[PDB]
Amino acid sequence: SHMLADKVKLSAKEILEKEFKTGVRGYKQEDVDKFLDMIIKDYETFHQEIEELQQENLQLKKQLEE
Amino acid sequence: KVKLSAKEILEKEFKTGVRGYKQEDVDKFLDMIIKDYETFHQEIEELQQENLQLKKQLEE
């Protein structure tokens, strides 16, 4: 019945800031950090997409008052 | 446009070095990110849906 949490768990800031423990062997850091950059780009790209579809749907409703 | 899919993040196999990141910690975080990708797409699809339903109502 209740309020909707911001359903997105992370932000672009939090991804960039995240620090991981190391082991005597694990994922090569440079490859993980690069992959995380692609992801950050996608997060930015998704918000812009949403922002635009919201504005475009608000535009369309203004036109419907007539 | 978009540079990754869920499927690509799921399937990615990093190289391992001698003092690399803990693999468990990275998977758990990647796993969070994947669920966010999913959330983003639903959000978009329902605004795409609504977008098309408003273009119909405007031609009528």
Per the structure, the count of domains in chain B is: 1
Residue A63 distance to chain B (closest CA, Å): 8
Is B55 in contact with A57 (Cβ distance < 8 A)?
A: no
Resolution reached, in Å?
Answer: 2.8
The coordinates were experimentally obtained by X-ray
B48-56 contacts, C-beta under 8 A, 24 or more apart: B48/A53, B50/A57, B51/A53, B51/A56, B51/A57, B51/A60, B54/A57, B54/A60, B54/A61, B54/A64, B55/A60
Is the dihedral angle over the CA atoms A42, B52, B47, A52 positive or is it negative?
A: positive
Chain A nearest-CA residue for B2? A42
Q: Say if the Cβ atoms of A23 and B20 lie within 8 Å.
A: yes
Q: Which structural domain range is residue A38 located in?
A: 1-66
Q: Which of A27, A40, A56 to mutate to test the interface with B (most CBs of B within 10 A)?
A: A27
Size of interface A-B (CB pairs under 8 A): 109
Q: Which residues contact A26 (CB under 8 A, 6 or more apart)?
A: A20, B16, B17, B19, B20, B21, B22, B23, B26
Q: B9: which chain A residues are within 8 Å (Cβ-Cβ)?
A: 39
A5/A19 Cα distance (integer angstroms): 25
